[PDB]
Design a protein around this ligand. Structure first.
Ligand SMILES: [Mg+2]
Ligand SMILES: [Mg+2]
Ligand SMILES: [Mg+2]
Ligand SMILES: [Mg+2]
Ligand SMILES: [Mg+2]
Ligand SMILES: [Mg+2]
Ligand SMILES: [Mg+2]
Ligand SMILES: [Mg+2]
Ligand SMILES: [Mg+2]
Ligand SMILES: [Mg+2]
Ligand SMILES: [Mg+2]
Ligand SMILES: [Mg+2]
Ligand SMILES: [Mg+2]
Ligand SMILES: [Mg+2]
Ligand SMILES: [Mg+2]
Ligand SMILES: [Mg+2]
Ligand SMILES: [Mg+2]
Ligand SMILES: [Mg+2]
Ligand SMILES: [Zn+2]
Lengths: 115, 108, 219, 152, 300
RNA sequence: UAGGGUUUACGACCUCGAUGUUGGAUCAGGACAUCCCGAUGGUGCAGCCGCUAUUAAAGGUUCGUUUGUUCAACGAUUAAAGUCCUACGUGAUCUGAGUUCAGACCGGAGUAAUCCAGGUCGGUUUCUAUCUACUUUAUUCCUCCCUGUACGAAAGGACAAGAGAAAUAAGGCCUACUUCACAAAGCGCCUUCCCCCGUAAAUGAUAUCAUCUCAACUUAGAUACCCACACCCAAGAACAGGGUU
RNA sequence: GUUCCUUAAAUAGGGACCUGUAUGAAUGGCUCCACGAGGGUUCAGCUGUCUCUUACUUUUAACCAGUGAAAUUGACCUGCCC
């Protein structure tokens, strides 16, 4: 459940999430009719004082049974079309995002580990 | 809140004279086979209960007079015997509580 | 005998026919799979049949924290720190998938729920994913690997210092002080241990469950 | 809401409730008869059931010893509970004690009841004797049962 | 004075009377078992514009149920205890049919009900939920309604008394947001606000206010059945059923548009084990329900 | 030429033996001078995007900052963050961030006190319900074959129908997730069943053509809930309701 | 107010300018190491204030027994719309 103003942990190989900052990258708004957001939903993340898009890749709270549950709010950056920003994802990605195979195809191919 | 007008004796009666507040007539009163002081269903008689309470009071008084001070309660049962009545050969180890008077018409 | 804790029913006041049907369904399901003996803290290896994944058979390893639920709702959370990050999946012991449920190491620990591993360093949770199992010898007692687990600094997520949980597996001498220990003991409730009216006698129920299991196996 | 909620309220909390329960159990083990409100009466009866069960489990057991020591502050009553009330009921299973309601008190007019272990030595309370077997309805039922037996 | 059957009986007649009552009830049930062996009335075929009789089961509990697609689906358990027809009244709108449910002792019942149940060869029941039916389907009273009336792959509507919450407030009875807890609440943490404007010197009927929540009859529409048991007489209804465990519920057919003509393969009157029908297995499964004892599914 | 007093003003009809005031929180009832989902004409309408007119109250009208603000500015959205009355709705439901008070300053007027339709610091928000009134009666975004078709020169890109997951509100449950523990719940799951009057077209007279008709006419045009002592309860303040084989 | 930073979003806060025509040097003006329940902003941690609340203990709450009243009351057989 990544809502507004949530210290999200970025996991990418770009110069945005890896660069240091005097503030943690907090969320902005969830691209959904409700304030709650699960895996697969897009979210706007603030990094270095900007407002770049992102994508929820697992949440801290446990949703259904089969899906996993991470200890941190893992999130991978993304652009308008997406078109991911990073180049390598070391952390494991859940197998729930593989149900699209159209909206986020490059994100799955760039990922290395999988649950 | 504050009453805008004064209630009437009629409204007062209608409020207090309703069957809800009126005491309901109970039909759980029955005659006891013994003594005879109209007991109540599912409830013990008053005279018999008072007699049993007095008997227990006397028994406790005698036990305290025998045991002496507090912090006793031995690890053996008890047997209440009144005047006479030779102790039975079964209750040999059970300490006897010598009681006065004769046995009543309900102790067995 | 062992008898899994998922077969014994709750202390509710429902119809025994529901529990009987649930036990029959669980036995019919186990007739295909296996579901061997395992306690809390044992390293397992579930192989689910996920569709959207590189290959139908999807394996995963982790330590069993707690096993809640009854009947077909029997589940168990497997924790395992892989690539630094911690993952926790809830596998149900009665699903149409799940090809095999291998066991790597049979353990028991001291607490019946290892929910305190979240607020602990990853050293006590990082385990290899491709490690061979270990034999428990020809029928041997359950080894209780008694060991103290170091916890993270004071900022926790459930306050494991209070005695309401009764863990007895967290080294409080290397993390907490005397004032914190006293403040935690202040919340103690000695009247809960000597409350005989709270226990749940499950002797005749366990005997009936074992008799039903034996009757089903005989058929 | 209190659906399926057991254990009623008594004192200023669970601690006071269990303390009053232990005090009543000790007083009963001492005198074998106490007048208490119906709620506390049934609570003490249910607690004494498990107390007798524990006492029957065994004396050498450490758990039973600790339970008796915690539920009997008088100390002198633990030997009695272990060596008088345990063997005397070695033939029964779980049916012990006896519940009988008291009419009313004299001040607050409370619904009190009586408690006492079966047997004992105190005088017997006036139990609710059922109708005799030589009455009209009883004789009719006996005749009906005799006819049914003769039929088969 | 108020008397009861367990008053003027000795300790030697109570168990005798109990055994007599039990034997009489068992004999009555055994006699009422076989329906077709007496007078099952003319059995008409199925028609487009017509309905059938429902059931009155006992909500045991809830259990999960999976499908071949690999998804979780909540499923309830409704035990069809006894369930027999009481009477039948024709045309003031449509034909009706009285159906019984769980068995009840014949001691704490009224005199009129006792006489009505003595006129028929069945014991007294708890609830009596009358259903609506047409003139085509008409079964003689007293016949048994087993759990095999419904079949897998059908939508069934269930209605019963919900778990009453008592004279609850507003946040629980209606889900109001209520006032906060600070800035600057002092006496308001779960109370409501205004009622109906200010000029309105009264309160509009139907205004949400504190009251008794639950304990009312509510119907559910769009609950599919996945399995039916013939031995223990159990129904597998998807979703939740209003009520508590071991609670009598009213079962019948759905009224949805898409689920109104699929009653061709289903029995028009009721299930008659006396066949001329061939007994059914332990339980009938659906096409998408994963049966127990089968190998692990695979999407390959 | 006709309708309103939403704003600023005119008189002070009851209120100075008291209508307690602006905002904020929840709660909403009604109206269209309607943002849309529903249905149409025109168009400087080739299709998506645009504008005007007729009907529609079954619904909603987001998340936050500065700001006491009702007002005003800014970031992400959505078909959308509309207006008005309800004592400029609601203080016997709640707070006072200013406004009506006692203390001290900042700039000015004033010998002085004192004052500012100029600003700031903080500034007791009381009531045991007497009566009226009340206390359980549907929808939508997105995606897919249609289709990258019709349209269109090219970009760009339609209605309609079917299928799958999600979003407000309403009715239920603890067996799977969570607070938990012989319960109750949500963070979890199921269901939500038929229109809405303005126009589009034949035959036909006043007015033999033609004419959709405030002429006679032909097409788009409610079903389900509920109804025979004493102990315990998933029913509950008592009462009432269910069970006591 | 001009302008930079501080929030992705700033009549809030800090840094340099005065058409301050009514600031201003014992009506004392500007800096300054300590300190103020004086007035504001803010970086790492948070607490159900909220998103969306529930379960539990006590007082309170409901019935049984009694002492037992305030403010207030023109009488009331005490409804809705126009
Ligand atoms: Mg936490
Ligand atoms: Mg009390
Ligand atoms: Mg709240
Ligand atoms: Mg308060
Ligand atoms: Mg106050
Ligand atoms: Mg005035
Ligand atoms: Mg006046
Ligand atoms: Mg006044
Ligand atoms: Mg209009
Ligand atoms: Mg106002
Ligand atoms: Mg008012
Ligand atoms: Mg102050
Ligand atoms: Mg107030
Ligand atoms: Mg009243
Ligand atoms: Mg009035
Ligand atoms: Mg602020
Ligand atoms: Mg000072
Ligand atoms: Mg009183
Ligand atoms: Zn008597």
């Amino acid at each position: 459940a990544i809502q507004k103003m949530t210290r999200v942990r970025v996991v990418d190989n770009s110069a945005l999430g890896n660069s240091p900052y005097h503030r943690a990258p907090r969320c902005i708004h969830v691209y959904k009719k409700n304030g709650v957001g699960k895996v697969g939903d897009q979210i706007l993340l603030a990094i270095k004082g900007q407002k770049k898009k992102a994508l929820i890749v697992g949440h801290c709270m446990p949703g259904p049974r089969m899906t996993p549950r991470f200890d941190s709010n893992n999130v991978v950056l993304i652009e308008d079309n997406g078109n991911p920003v990073g180049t390598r994802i070391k952390t494991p990605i859940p197998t729930s995002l593989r149900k699209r195979e159209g909206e986020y195809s490059k994100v799955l191919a760039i990922a290395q580990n999988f649950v | 809140a504050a009453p805008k007008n004064r209630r009437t004796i009629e409204v007062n009666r209608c409020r207090r004279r309703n069957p809800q507040k009126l005491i309901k007539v109970k039909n759980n009163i029955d005659v006891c086979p013994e003594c005879g002081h109209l007991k109540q269903k599912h409830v013990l008689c008053a005279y018999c209960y008072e007699k049993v309470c007095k008997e227990t009071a006397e028994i406790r008084r005698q036990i305290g007079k025998q045991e002496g001070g507090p912090f006793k309660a031995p690890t053996i049962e008890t047997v209440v015997l009144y005047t006479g009545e030779t102790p039975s050969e079964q209750d040999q180890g059970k300490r006897i509580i010598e009681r006065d008077r004769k046995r009543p018409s309900w102790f067995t | 005998r062992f008898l899994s804790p998922e077969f014994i029913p709750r202390r509710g006041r429902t119809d025994p026919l529901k529990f009987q049907i649930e036990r029959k369904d669980m036995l019919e399901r186990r007739k295909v799979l296996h579901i061997p003996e395992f306690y809390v803290g044992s390293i397992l290896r579930v192989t689910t049949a996920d569709p959207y994944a590189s290959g139908k058979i999807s394996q995963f390893l982790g330590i069993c924290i707690q096993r809640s639920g009854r009947g077909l709702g029997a589940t168990f959370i497997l924790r395992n720190v892989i690539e630094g990050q911690g993952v926790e999946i809830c596998f149900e012991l009665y699903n149409p998938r799940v090809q095999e449920i291998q066991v790597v190491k049979l353990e028991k620990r001291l607490d019946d729920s290892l929910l305190y591993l979240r607020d602990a360093l990853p050293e006590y949770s990082t385990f290899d994913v491709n490690m061979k199992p270990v034999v428990q010898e020809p029928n041997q007692k359950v080894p209780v690997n008694e060991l103290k687990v170091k916890m993270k600094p004071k900022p926790w997520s459930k306050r494991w210092e209070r005695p309401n949980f009764n863990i007895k597996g967290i080294r409080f001498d290397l993390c907490l002080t005397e004032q914190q220990m006293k403040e935690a003991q202040k919340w103690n409730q000695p009247w809960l241990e000597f409350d005989m009216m709270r226990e749940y006698d499950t002797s005749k129920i366990e005997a009936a469950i074992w008799k039903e299991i034996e009757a089903s196996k005989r058929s | 809401i209190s659906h399926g909620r057991v254990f009623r309220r008594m004192g200023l909390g669970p601690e006071s409730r269990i303390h009053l329960l232990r005090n009543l159990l000790t007083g009963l083990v001492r005198h074998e008869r106490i007048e208490a409100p119906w709620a506390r009466v049934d609570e003490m009866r249910g607690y004494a059931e498990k107390l007798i069960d524990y006492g029957k489990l065994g004396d050498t057991n450490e758990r039973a010893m600790r339970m008796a020591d915690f539920w009997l502050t008088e100390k002198d009553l633990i030997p009695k509970l272990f060596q008088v009330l345990a063997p005397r009921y070695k033939d029964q299973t779980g049916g012990y004690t006896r519940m009988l309601q008291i009419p009313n008190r004299s001040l607050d007019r409370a619904k009190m009841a009586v408690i006492e272990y079966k047997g004992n030595c105190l005088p017997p309370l006036p139990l609710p004797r059922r109708d005799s077997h030589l009455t009209l309805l009883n004789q009719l039922l006996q005749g009906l049962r005799q006819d049914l037996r003769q039929s088969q | 004075s108020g008397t009861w059957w367990d008053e003027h009986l000795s300790e030697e007649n109570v168990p005798f009377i109990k055994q007599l009552v039990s034997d009489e009830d068992k004999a009555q049930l055994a006699s009422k078992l076989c329906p077709l062996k007496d007078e099952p009335w003319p059995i008409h075929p199925w028609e487009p514009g017509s309905f059938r009789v429902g059931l009155i089961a006992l909500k045991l509990g809830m259990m999960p149920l999976w499908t071949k697609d690999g998804q979780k689906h909540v499923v309830t358990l409704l035990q069809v205890q006894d369930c027999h027809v009481l009477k039948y009244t024709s045309k003031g709108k449509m034909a009706t049919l009285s159906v019984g449910g769980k068995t009840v002792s014949r001691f704490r019942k009224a005199t009129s009900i006792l006489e009505f149940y003595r006129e028929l060869g069945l014991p007294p029941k708890q609830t009596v939920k009358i259903f609506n039916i047409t003139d085509n389907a008409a079964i003689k009273p007293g016949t048994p309604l087993y759990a095999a009336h419904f079949r897998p792959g059908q939508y069934v509507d269930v209605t019963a008394k919900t778990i009453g919450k008592g004279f609850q407030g507003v946040m629980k009875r209606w889900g109001f947001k209520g006032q906060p807890a600070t800035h600057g609440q002092t006496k308001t943490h779960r109370r409501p606000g205004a009622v109906a404007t200010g000029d309105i010197g009264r309160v509009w009927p139907g205004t949400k206010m504190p009251g008794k929540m639950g304990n009312i009859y509510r119907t559910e529409y769009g609950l599919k059945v996945w399995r039916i048991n013939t031995k223990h007489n159990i129904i597998y209804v998807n979703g939740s059923v209003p009520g508590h465990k071991n609670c009598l519920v009213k079962v019948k057919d759905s009224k949805l548009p898409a689920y109104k003509d699929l009653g061709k393969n289903l029995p028009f009157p009721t299930y008659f084990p006396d066949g001329d029908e061939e007994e059914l297995p332990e339980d009938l499964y659906d096409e998408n329900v994963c049966q127990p004892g089968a190998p692990s599914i695979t999407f390959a």
